[PDB]
Amino acid sequence: SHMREIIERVKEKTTIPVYERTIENVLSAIQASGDVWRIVDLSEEPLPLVVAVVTALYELGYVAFENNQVILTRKGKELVEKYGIGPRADYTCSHCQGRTVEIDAFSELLEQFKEITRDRPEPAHQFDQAYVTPETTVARVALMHSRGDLENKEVFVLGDDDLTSVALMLSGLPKRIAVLDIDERLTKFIEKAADEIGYENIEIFTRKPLPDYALHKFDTFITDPPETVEAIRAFVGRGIATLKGPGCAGYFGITRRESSLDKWREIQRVLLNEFGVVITDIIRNFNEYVNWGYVEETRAWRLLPIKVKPSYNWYKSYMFRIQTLEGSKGFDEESSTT
Amino acid sequence: SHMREIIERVKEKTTIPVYERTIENVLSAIQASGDVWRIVDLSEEPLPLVVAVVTALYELGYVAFENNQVILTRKGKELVEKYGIGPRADYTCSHCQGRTVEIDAFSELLEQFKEITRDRPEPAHQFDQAYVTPETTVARVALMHSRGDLENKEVFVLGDDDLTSVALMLSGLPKRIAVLDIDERLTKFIEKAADEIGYENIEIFTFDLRPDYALHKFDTFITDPPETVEAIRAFVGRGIATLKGPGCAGYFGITRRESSLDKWREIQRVLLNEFGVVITDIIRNFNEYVNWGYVEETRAWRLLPIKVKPSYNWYKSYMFRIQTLEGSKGFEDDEESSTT
Ligand SMILES: [Fe+3]
């Protein structure tokens, strides 16, 4: 009734699937915060969907924009009370940030990584770039090592915005590392680091039918793909094809910020049915991305009905781990952050 | 060579899939702890398979039993040195226990749940029973709440030796609760608790397997099924059948203690291909199970090379959350299990 009217207005603004739950996640988020970034964060719906919901609400008189905040009109408060939609709570563990692992034991690694990455290459708009916080990076090392995927393993880093490979060198855990990125700024920076650190067993390389040096040679890959079905499949699929065989691990990040749960379902059928891998871990908001400098240039910025820069790291991704088994094999509308 | 000889000897003892990684996980675990239960824990391989690997290792001189501990021999030290297998590290967050959620805000609920559950029915061997820690229970409530799946929601609890339906009553969050279990001791206990708490909107059912009263009527379900593909398919799929439509949630535990990753792959194909649901969260060791009193009568005890009672809660399951989408549909003991 109330809800129907909203849903059809949202459908006129986006072809991203829209459910009553979409609207409800947004309304729950709005009750807990007026900040558009944190609304996207807390609703766990993709930015362009959130915008189309908040916009529909504002057109149909349930939300107001006021003080650069998204707030419920009196009509919106009748809506949430009528549907029993409470303010979204969050009980994320304040020690691990919900990562499940503590990094107390990697404190000097953290310090070093922080120091060495002070002059890191600034994220480039045309490589869809952004890097995770050094804390995330070190949490990544602690996570991988706790699943037995680092020590004396051969590790392939497919894309390295985050400079995970520099953290891996400083940990001293891998037998060897291979890293690949399109951006020559990164690969030069990594090589300079390796050469000065004296890490010998690292190959750097600056997308199609894998070379000899990659194919079936690694124990573990990490990647953080662009957020499309095709790119997730390409990148994760190529990661899997680097793996020696059964018993090998893959790590990658998938967001709720740019991918809807309908997308997730297609991604999960690729992993399970095209690659025949098993998903061993899916950890909410494991990856915290540092806010990037080219935002005013992005579609997300043009979509926002309130132009305000984010005041915290609103953009996070879930950590996926996969493992290979017998038979495993390797190889949009919801997007806005380019 | 060493590895091949160990794998072939393990294959003579189990029909569970065996990989080099299997042997590696066990050897890595053994270097962190000699306690058999902790080895099963740390290795994240199914208990009967860890027993087979440890026996095969023993038979061939790579491990010994000393002071009730599994330890590497000199020959075993040379094997791990050769394959570069270090001791398994564990960095589980010490404050949340790796649950991702903290429960400081539910300390009232916790004491209340502990007090109400002091005299709960003892886990019956004939059913598959073990209950999670009170802390697990409340962390479940915090997780479900933080995902927007409790407050003013209709919640179906399918099986409840954990007494989640009781913690849910004390939380006051749901609009209503339905619970089903075979064990009439449990449903009696939950009725009484509903009566004393004076929670009025709970429906309790006591029977085995398959109503109007469940089908397409709930927002959220929770269940903790027996660990076979068929049981997971039936329990989780029934759970999905209680859901209204898209946008609804279910929660359930799956163990690495009693299911191999090969089994995990079949389960995940069920969830994605037969039910068409999406997996939103898979959280390692979220659920901590209270050691159960009938242990000496189980298959696990009988298989153990050393018959020592566990000194800690070694048995844990991953939390899975799923969500329904357009087109999702529901449903209309085995080789790797051993808690019997
Ligand atoms: Fe924590």
XYZ file of C-alpha atoms and ligand atoms in Angstrom:
679
model
C 0.000 0.000 0.000
C 2.456 2.616 1.332
C 5.114 0.066 0.414
C 3.758 -0.703 -3.064
C 3.747 2.968 -4.040
C 7.383 3.247 -3.018
C 8.487 0.119 -4.768
C 7.052 1.174 -8.158
C 8.631 4.575 -7.974
C 11.981 2.895 -7.261
C 11.514 0.597 -10.267
C 11.169 3.709 -12.472
C 14.642 4.887 -11.396
C 16.834 1.773 -11.731
C 16.716 -1.776 -13.222
C 18.595 -3.109 -10.146
C 16.207 -5.633 -8.494
C 14.085 -3.953 -5.770
C 12.391 -5.849 -2.942
C 10.352 -4.768 0.055
C 13.502 -5.751 1.982
C 15.527 -3.188 -0.020
C 13.204 -0.442 1.101
C 13.240 -1.771 4.645
C 17.058 -1.974 4.846
C 17.227 1.670 3.644
C 14.575 2.859 6.114
C 16.273 1.007 8.991
C 19.560 2.669 7.976
C 18.000 6.123 7.790
C 16.699 5.788 11.364
C 20.255 5.176 12.624
C 21.992 7.879 10.542
C 21.308 10.849 8.307
C 24.595 10.641 6.540
C 24.125 9.320 3.011
C 27.467 7.394 3.092
C 26.625 5.626 6.327
C 23.108 4.943 4.989
C 24.678 3.077 2.049
C 27.046 1.382 4.559
C 24.359 0.261 6.998
C 21.652 -0.733 4.479
C 24.101 -3.093 2.740
C 22.477 -2.162 -0.551
C 24.336 -0.931 -3.617
C 24.873 2.851 -3.817
C 22.784 3.408 -6.913
C 19.904 1.429 -5.462
C 20.072 3.288 -2.194
C 19.912 6.617 -4.097
C 16.883 5.502 -6.080
C 15.120 4.411 -2.834
C 15.993 7.565 -0.896
C 14.952 9.647 -3.940
C 11.624 7.787 -4.276
C 10.968 8.248 -0.627
C 11.646 12.020 -0.939
C 9.365 12.305 -3.985
C 6.551 10.462 -2.228
C 6.867 12.461 0.993
C 8.378 9.992 3.466
C 11.923 11.570 3.505
C 13.292 15.077 3.685
C 16.764 16.394 2.889
C 17.487 18.926 5.442
C 20.827 20.067 6.851
C 22.613 17.886 4.276
C 20.950 14.921 6.109
C 18.451 12.327 4.968
C 15.649 12.272 7.523
C 12.175 10.773 7.841
C 9.162 13.081 7.408
C 6.276 12.487 9.831
C 4.787 10.375 7.054
C 8.020 8.271 6.983
C 7.808 7.767 10.743
C 4.247 6.481 10.350
C 5.592 4.152 7.666
C 8.339 2.600 9.858
C 6.148 2.351 12.912
C 3.396 0.750 10.849
C 5.818 -1.838 9.392
C 7.805 -2.318 12.594
C 11.074 -1.209 10.891
C 13.448 -0.329 13.716
C 16.749 1.542 13.514
C 19.557 -0.652 12.288
C 21.809 -1.825 15.170
C 25.432 -2.704 14.753
C 27.400 -4.799 17.193
C 30.565 -5.162 15.191
C 33.353 -6.296 17.536
C 35.232 -3.093 18.393
C 38.647 -4.909 18.889
C 38.927 -6.801 15.571
C 36.609 -4.484 13.623
C 34.684 -7.650 12.791
C 37.639 -9.116 10.951
C 37.695 -12.138 13.341
C 41.459 -11.879 13.819
C 43.510 -9.696 16.079
C 46.779 -8.152 14.856
C 48.512 -7.672 18.271
C 51.126 -10.173 17.194
C 51.887 -8.195 13.970
C 52.384 -4.806 15.615
C 55.922 -4.136 14.312
C 54.924 -5.342 10.796
C 52.044 -2.770 10.905
C 54.383 0.049 11.920
C 56.835 -0.871 9.163
C 54.170 -1.209 6.517
C 52.712 2.140 7.504
C 56.171 3.729 7.200
C 57.139 2.125 3.933
C 53.754 2.980 2.316
C 53.787 6.759 3.262
C 54.929 7.615 -0.319
C 52.793 4.958 -2.016
C 51.318 5.841 -5.452
C 48.111 7.839 -5.108
C 44.955 5.991 -6.307
C 44.358 6.652 -10.028
C 40.796 7.290 -11.158
C 41.342 5.449 -14.462
C 42.420 2.177 -12.746
C 39.333 2.156 -10.447
C 41.875 2.302 -7.603
C 41.648 2.489 -3.824
C 43.676 0.914 -1.121
C 42.726 -0.689 2.114
C 43.906 0.561 5.420
C 47.271 -0.756 6.651
C 45.291 -2.446 9.413
C 43.248 -4.307 6.822
C 46.450 -5.331 4.988
C 47.974 -6.761 8.162
C 44.698 -8.426 9.135
C 44.864 -10.058 5.686
C 48.297 -11.494 6.463
C 47.100 -12.712 9.875
C 43.982 -14.283 8.340
C 45.851 -16.102 5.514
C 48.477 -17.399 7.929
C 45.913 -18.637 10.371
C 44.328 -20.720 7.565
C 47.817 -22.219 6.763
C 48.041 -20.362 3.392
C 51.323 -18.347 3.783
C 54.252 -19.980 5.494
C 56.593 -21.458 2.875
C 53.829 -21.109 0.297
C 54.043 -19.609 -3.176
C 51.631 -16.691 -3.269
C 50.217 -14.892 -6.341
C 48.895 -11.372 -5.940
C 46.639 -10.459 -8.820
C 46.403 -6.689 -8.790
C 48.081 -4.829 -5.902
C 46.539 -1.443 -5.164
C 46.775 -2.451 -1.545
C 50.432 -3.367 -1.630
C 49.708 -6.733 -0.025
C 52.911 -8.036 -1.594
C 54.958 -5.476 0.400
C 53.289 -6.733 3.610
C 54.006 -10.305 2.546
C 57.716 -9.499 2.037
C 57.922 -7.827 5.461
C 56.243 -10.878 7.142
C 58.927 -13.122 5.792
C 56.347 -15.949 5.529
C 56.132 -16.962 1.840
C 58.607 -19.159 -0.016
C 57.986 -16.720 -2.888
C 55.629 -14.115 -4.235
C 54.450 -13.109 -7.697
C 52.672 -9.857 -8.251
C 50.946 -8.386 -11.194
C 49.385 -5.038 -11.841
C 48.539 -2.870 -14.810
C 49.709 0.268 -13.068
C 53.455 0.705 -13.549
C 53.577 3.081 -10.622
C 52.734 0.115 -8.314
C 55.026 -2.456 -9.896
C 57.944 0.005 -9.803
C 57.175 0.847 -6.200
C 57.080 -2.900 -5.275
C 60.313 -3.685 -7.064
C 62.101 -0.755 -5.418
C 60.862 -2.057 -2.061
C 61.939 -5.671 -2.748
C 65.344 -4.571 -3.967
C 66.000 -2.402 -0.924
C 64.551 -4.911 1.553
C 66.647 -7.608 -0.148
C 63.630 -9.886 -0.724
C 64.957 -12.162 -3.528
C 61.995 -14.483 -4.355
C 59.504 -12.039 -5.874
C 58.677 -11.655 -9.578
C 56.792 -8.631 -10.736
C 54.865 -8.369 -13.964
C 53.037 -5.574 -15.764
C 44.113 -10.498 -18.458
C 44.289 -13.306 -21.063
C 45.362 -17.044 -21.507
C 47.817 -17.413 -18.664
C 51.570 -17.511 -19.165
C 53.923 -20.395 -18.229
C 55.114 -18.611 -15.096
C 51.525 -18.446 -13.623
C 49.609 -21.531 -14.739
C 49.219 -24.157 -11.965
C 52.285 -22.877 -9.967
C 50.928 -21.309 -6.749
C 49.536 -22.428 -3.429
C 47.467 -19.281 -2.713
C 46.239 -16.261 -4.656
C 44.781 -12.964 -3.547
C 42.932 -10.507 -5.689
C 40.366 -7.735 -5.341
C 38.388 -7.594 -8.552
C 36.260 -4.978 -10.147
C 32.697 -5.444 -9.147
C 31.069 -7.097 -12.129
C 30.081 -10.649 -12.731
C 32.376 -10.794 -15.764
C 35.362 -9.220 -14.013
C 34.889 -11.310 -10.842
C 34.822 -14.353 -12.988
C 37.813 -13.291 -15.059
C 39.969 -12.325 -12.111
C 38.956 -15.001 -9.669
C 38.955 -17.599 -12.528
C 42.508 -16.608 -13.500
C 43.517 -16.752 -9.831
C 42.179 -20.293 -9.571
C 44.073 -21.317 -12.746
C 47.328 -20.180 -11.010
C 46.725 -22.788 -8.294
C 48.631 -26.076 -8.286
C 45.579 -28.189 -7.772
C 43.314 -29.373 -4.898
C 44.104 -28.014 -1.431
C 45.008 -24.481 -2.587
C 43.432 -21.212 -1.395
C 42.058 -18.025 -2.941
C 41.202 -14.708 -1.202
C 39.195 -11.851 -2.678
C 36.894 -9.036 -1.706
C 33.280 -8.608 -2.753
C 31.238 -5.524 -1.714
C 27.597 -4.922 -1.009
C 28.329 -1.270 -2.084
C 28.478 -2.037 -5.779
C 26.985 -5.498 -6.079
C 23.404 -6.474 -5.130
C 22.559 -9.793 -3.583
C 21.106 -10.853 -6.971
C 24.629 -10.313 -8.343
C 26.110 -12.267 -5.447
C 23.945 -15.229 -6.281
C 25.264 -15.226 -9.911
C 28.867 -14.886 -8.556
C 28.322 -17.797 -6.186
C 26.975 -20.044 -9.026
C 30.103 -19.164 -11.049
C 32.358 -20.205 -8.112
C 30.439 -23.391 -7.379
C 29.346 -24.569 -10.828
C 31.829 -23.151 -13.320
C 34.953 -23.359 -11.075
C 33.796 -26.076 -8.636
C 35.501 -24.403 -5.730
C 34.188 -24.349 -2.166
C 33.603 -21.086 -0.213
C 35.165 -21.538 3.258
C 34.743 -17.998 4.697
C 32.570 -14.919 3.954
C 33.422 -12.139 6.447
C 31.478 -8.907 6.515
C 33.350 -5.677 6.069
C 36.736 -7.354 6.518
C 38.302 -4.859 4.037
C 38.209 -1.122 4.919
C 39.092 1.131 1.927
C 40.800 4.490 2.536
C 38.726 7.268 0.902
C 40.063 8.031 -2.532
C 40.859 11.470 -3.968
C 39.044 11.378 -7.306
C 35.512 10.986 -5.847
C 34.066 14.239 -7.139
C 34.742 12.840 -10.597
C 32.789 9.599 -10.095
C 29.329 8.556 -11.078
C 28.561 7.989 -7.337
C 29.182 11.681 -6.729
C 26.860 12.740 -9.523
C 24.188 10.326 -8.242
C 24.183 11.707 -4.672
C 21.231 13.996 -3.858
C 23.473 15.558 -1.134
C 27.048 16.424 -2.270
C 29.080 15.933 0.955
C 32.459 14.175 1.123
C 32.617 11.043 3.294
C 33.872 11.674 6.856
C 34.927 8.088 7.598
C 35.847 5.000 5.502
C 32.280 4.092 4.397
C 33.424 1.742 1.612
C 34.111 -1.835 2.831
C 34.132 -5.312 1.227
C 33.527 -8.778 2.575
C 36.490 -11.155 2.567
C 35.844 -14.397 0.624
C 38.079 -17.435 0.975
C 37.857 -20.300 -1.421
C 39.566 -23.633 -1.500
C 40.180 -25.959 -4.431
C 39.040 -29.608 -4.435
C 39.031 -32.586 -6.866
C 37.607 -31.256 -10.104
C 38.080 -27.539 -9.381
C 39.114 -25.480 -12.335
C 39.894 -21.976 -13.273
C 39.305 -19.828 -16.322
C 27.289 -2.611 -14.860
C 24.162 -0.795 -13.403
C 25.078 -1.412 -9.755
C 28.582 0.077 -10.207
C 29.316 3.791 -9.435
C 32.853 4.374 -7.992
C 34.564 5.187 -11.374
C 57.492 -40.165 -1.625
C 56.788 -39.762 2.081
C 53.558 -37.947 1.261
C 52.405 -40.571 -1.248
C 52.994 -43.375 1.231
C 50.988 -41.555 3.906
C 48.075 -40.785 1.567
C 47.794 -44.371 0.376
C 47.839 -45.663 3.868
C 45.092 -43.145 4.803
C 42.995 -44.260 1.796
C 43.073 -47.793 3.141
C 41.150 -46.512 6.206
C 38.506 -44.019 5.116
C 36.372 -43.350 2.129
C 36.504 -39.600 2.856
C 38.506 -37.740 0.186
C 42.185 -37.340 1.145
C 44.459 -34.664 -0.364
C 48.049 -33.665 0.416
C 46.471 -30.583 2.109
C 44.661 -32.953 4.461
C 47.954 -34.384 5.697
C 49.464 -30.941 5.864
C 46.612 -29.491 7.972
C 46.970 -32.357 10.479
C 50.776 -32.098 10.662
C 50.524 -28.325 11.085
C 48.000 -28.846 13.878
C 50.092 -31.518 15.606
C 53.016 -29.041 15.874
C 50.765 -26.518 17.659
C 49.193 -29.045 20.075
C 49.426 -32.698 20.987
C 45.840 -32.845 22.325
C 43.823 -34.925 19.870
C 40.734 -32.706 20.242
C 42.752 -29.548 19.575
C 44.328 -31.278 16.571
C 40.837 -31.916 15.135
C 39.965 -28.285 15.974
C 43.049 -26.694 14.473
C 43.269 -28.883 11.409
C 39.615 -28.219 10.403
C 39.374 -31.739 8.990
C 36.586 -34.124 9.943
C 37.312 -36.166 13.052
C 37.308 -39.612 11.367
C 39.710 -38.333 8.725
C 42.057 -36.726 11.356
C 42.003 -40.110 13.158
C 42.909 -41.942 9.949
C 45.751 -39.511 9.146
C 47.115 -39.667 12.707
C 46.974 -43.482 12.691
C 48.630 -43.707 9.275
C 51.356 -41.345 10.541
C 51.739 -43.487 13.666
C 51.936 -46.701 11.773
C 54.743 -45.387 9.590
C 56.857 -43.770 12.363
C 56.137 -40.112 11.843
C 54.152 -39.722 15.129
C 54.266 -41.194 18.606
C 51.926 -41.118 21.558
C 53.599 -39.786 24.715
C 51.948 -38.687 27.896
C 48.652 -38.972 26.121
C 49.835 -36.453 23.469
C 50.315 -36.924 19.692
C 53.852 -35.816 18.878
C 56.157 -35.807 15.946
C 59.067 -38.224 16.036
C 62.433 -37.423 14.548
C 61.259 -38.884 11.337
C 58.128 -36.640 11.574
C 60.243 -33.577 12.222
C 62.215 -34.372 9.082
C 58.929 -34.730 7.069
C 57.572 -31.283 8.166
C 61.000 -29.687 7.643
C 61.066 -31.111 4.100
C 57.543 -30.046 3.089
C 57.945 -26.726 4.913
C 54.921 -27.286 7.191
C 54.983 -24.969 10.218
C 52.876 -25.079 13.422
C 49.317 -23.819 12.858
C 48.909 -20.230 14.034
C 45.644 -18.933 15.486
C 44.900 -15.241 15.751
C 41.186 -15.543 16.634
C 40.012 -12.216 18.064
C 40.211 -12.689 21.816
C 37.293 -10.336 22.623
C 34.584 -11.586 20.200
C 35.949 -15.175 19.934
C 35.938 -14.653 16.175
C 32.165 -14.076 16.148
C 32.504 -10.597 14.567
C 29.908 -9.271 17.046
C 30.366 -8.196 20.642
C 27.674 -8.797 23.296
C 28.483 -6.141 26.018
C 25.050 -4.627 25.122
C 23.274 -7.889 25.845
C 24.823 -8.574 29.334
C 21.325 -8.355 30.947
C 19.994 -10.949 28.437
C 22.964 -13.209 29.075
C 22.596 -13.487 32.824
C 18.842 -13.948 32.351
C 19.416 -16.717 29.769
C 22.019 -18.407 31.975
C 19.674 -18.337 34.971
C 16.657 -19.582 33.015
C 18.713 -22.419 31.466
C 20.397 -23.832 34.628
C 18.055 -26.864 34.634
C 17.741 -27.404 30.885
C 17.215 -30.946 29.605
C 20.447 -32.924 29.355
C 21.553 -33.638 25.774
C 20.138 -36.978 24.752
C 22.364 -39.270 22.750
C 19.388 -40.706 20.776
C 18.659 -37.224 19.461
C 21.677 -35.484 18.008
C 22.025 -33.175 20.966
C 24.422 -30.622 22.176
C 23.708 -27.044 23.114
C 25.835 -24.030 22.387
C 27.310 -21.831 25.086
C 25.088 -19.065 26.479
C 27.534 -16.625 24.956
C 27.049 -18.207 21.568
C 23.263 -17.955 22.016
C 23.344 -14.294 22.787
C 25.904 -13.550 20.087
C 23.381 -15.248 17.696
C 20.744 -12.739 18.835
C 23.175 -9.851 18.353
C 24.135 -11.084 14.874
C 20.545 -11.670 13.682
C 19.604 -8.282 15.146
C 22.495 -6.483 13.512
C 21.381 -7.926 10.108
C 17.795 -6.649 10.623
C 16.229 -10.107 11.014
C 14.607 -10.045 14.517
C 12.891 -6.811 15.518
C 9.194 -7.112 14.906
C 9.909 -10.204 12.746
C 8.271 -13.609 12.684
C 10.975 -16.105 13.583
C 10.844 -19.910 13.051
C 13.194 -22.029 15.138
C 13.590 -25.494 13.615
C 15.043 -27.710 16.298
C 16.021 -26.117 19.544
C 18.348 -27.911 21.930
C 20.216 -24.637 21.990
C 17.166 -22.923 23.452
C 17.468 -20.035 21.026
C 13.690 -19.578 21.265
C 14.139 -18.765 24.978
C 16.822 -16.139 24.386
C 14.590 -14.763 21.707
C 11.671 -14.457 24.185
C 13.891 -12.674 26.710
C 15.143 -10.263 24.007
C 11.612 -9.117 23.341
C 12.534 -8.451 19.702
C 10.417 -10.722 17.607
C 6.807 -10.056 16.756
C 6.379 -13.836 17.141
C 8.201 -17.057 17.535
C 7.449 -20.630 16.377
C 9.518 -23.595 17.505
C 9.538 -27.281 16.581
C 11.547 -30.156 18.044
C 11.284 -33.956 18.360
C 12.332 -33.931 21.985
C 9.218 -33.349 24.087
C 11.514 -32.522 27.054
C 12.625 -29.427 25.141
C 9.245 -28.279 24.050
C 7.899 -28.753 27.589
C 10.773 -26.667 28.916
C 10.191 -23.931 26.314
C 6.387 -23.906 27.096
C 7.146 -23.439 30.777
C 9.602 -20.678 30.055
C 7.040 -18.963 27.819
C 4.493 -19.286 30.689
C 6.830 -17.859 33.354
C 8.270 -15.108 31.109
C 4.627 -14.573 30.117
C 5.632 -14.350 26.416
C 2.271 -14.742 24.691
C 3.150 -14.960 20.920
C 5.017 -18.269 20.704
C 3.710 -21.492 19.088
C 5.413 -24.726 20.106
C 5.215 -28.001 18.159
C 6.534 -31.390 19.150
C 7.130 -33.969 16.550
C 9.570 -35.572 14.102
C 9.375 -34.669 10.327
C 7.072 -33.764 7.460
C 2.107 -27.491 8.184
C -0.246 -24.644 7.214
C 1.044 -22.983 10.294
C 4.623 -22.790 8.906
C 4.465 -22.492 5.139
C 5.362 -19.048 3.726
C 4.602 -17.372 7.063
C 7.968 -16.252 8.568
C 10.603 -13.577 8.051
C 13.556 -15.525 9.480
C 14.488 -19.051 10.384
C 17.176 -20.639 12.428
C 18.213 -24.285 12.560
C 21.278 -26.334 13.324
C 20.957 -29.492 11.283
C 22.515 -32.938 11.541
C 25.587 -33.102 9.421
C 24.804 -34.911 6.261
C 23.920 -33.446 2.872
C 20.431 -34.989 3.028
C 19.739 -33.540 6.496
C 21.043 -30.130 5.526
C 18.967 -30.163 2.379
C 15.844 -31.153 4.343
C 16.310 -28.923 7.389
C 17.558 -25.811 5.603
C 15.136 -26.336 2.706
C 12.228 -26.672 5.142
C 13.478 -23.495 6.779
C 13.401 -21.784 3.419
C 9.840 -23.065 2.871
C 8.644 -21.209 6.005
C 9.825 -17.897 4.519
C 7.329 -15.406 3.055
C 9.216 -14.557 -0.075
C 12.299 -12.727 -1.131
C 14.121 -10.639 1.439
C 13.945 -13.196 4.217
C 16.762 -14.822 6.121
C 17.963 -18.048 7.533
C 20.724 -18.982 9.850
C 22.389 -22.309 10.441
C 25.627 -24.023 11.556
C 27.858 -26.219 9.451
C 30.873 -27.900 10.976
C 34.357 -28.786 9.664
C 34.341 -31.432 12.498
C 31.866 -33.743 10.840
C 31.803 -32.488 7.147
C 34.708 -32.403 4.682
C 35.047 -29.465 2.231
C 33.970 -31.889 -0.504
C 30.703 -32.181 1.455
C 30.711 -28.362 1.871
C 30.799 -28.073 -1.952
C 27.720 -30.335 -2.360
C 25.881 -28.379 0.384
C 26.674 -25.057 -1.320
C 25.454 -26.365 -4.684
C 22.199 -27.405 -2.974
C 21.778 -23.889 -1.552
C 22.569 -22.057 -4.805
C 21.149 -24.460 -7.483
C 18.250 -26.305 -5.815
C 17.083 -23.541 -3.460
C 18.399 -20.462 -5.344
C 19.342 -18.642 -2.112
C 22.466 -16.444 -1.689
C 25.017 -16.969 1.091
C 25.616 -13.716 2.856
C 27.946 -14.752 5.717
C 30.138 -17.747 6.607
C 31.789 -17.165 9.966
C 34.334 -19.640 11.267
C 33.740 -21.134 14.740
C 30.910 -18.809 15.571
C 29.118 -21.538 17.467
C 30.852 -23.161 20.481
C 29.252 -26.378 21.678
C 29.153 -27.444 25.317
C 30.827 -30.824 25.700
C 28.130 -33.409 26.049
C 27.880 -36.098 28.712
C 27.241 -39.124 26.426
C 30.666 -38.854 24.723
C 31.989 -42.221 25.871
C 29.134 -43.904 23.965
C 29.849 -42.275 20.552
C 31.638 -43.212 17.357
C 34.258 -40.439 17.923
C 35.319 -41.847 21.314
C 35.511 -45.341 19.835
C 37.720 -44.112 16.974
C 40.139 -42.106 19.163
C 43.622 -43.582 19.515
C 43.686 -42.068 22.988
C 40.483 -41.947 25.018
C 40.774 -38.715 26.950
C 37.893 -36.416 27.760
C 38.079 -33.027 26.041
C 39.383 -30.290 28.366
C 37.804 -27.422 26.451
C 34.920 -26.833 24.045
C 36.669 -28.283 20.905
C 33.535 -28.701 18.850
C 32.515 -25.540 16.952
C 30.492 -24.790 13.800
C 30.563 -22.043 11.234
C 27.606 -19.692 11.088
C 25.930 -19.469 7.665
C 23.422 -16.811 6.826
C 21.368 -17.015 3.630
C 18.860 -14.624 2.097
C 16.031 -15.318 -0.341
C 15.707 -13.635 -3.700
C 13.341 -13.684 -6.687
C 12.957 -17.349 -7.643
C 14.234 -18.896 -4.389
C 12.541 -22.151 -3.402
C 12.562 -24.452 -0.414
C 12.238 -28.153 0.162
C 9.161 -30.384 -0.284
C 24.564 -39.862 10.418
C 27.107 -40.482 7.557
C 30.826 -41.411 6.786
C 32.318 -38.148 8.150
C 30.058 -37.830 11.251
C 31.080 -39.362 14.564
C 29.466 -37.538 17.538
C 26.730 -40.206 16.823
Fe 36.667 -9.340 17.613
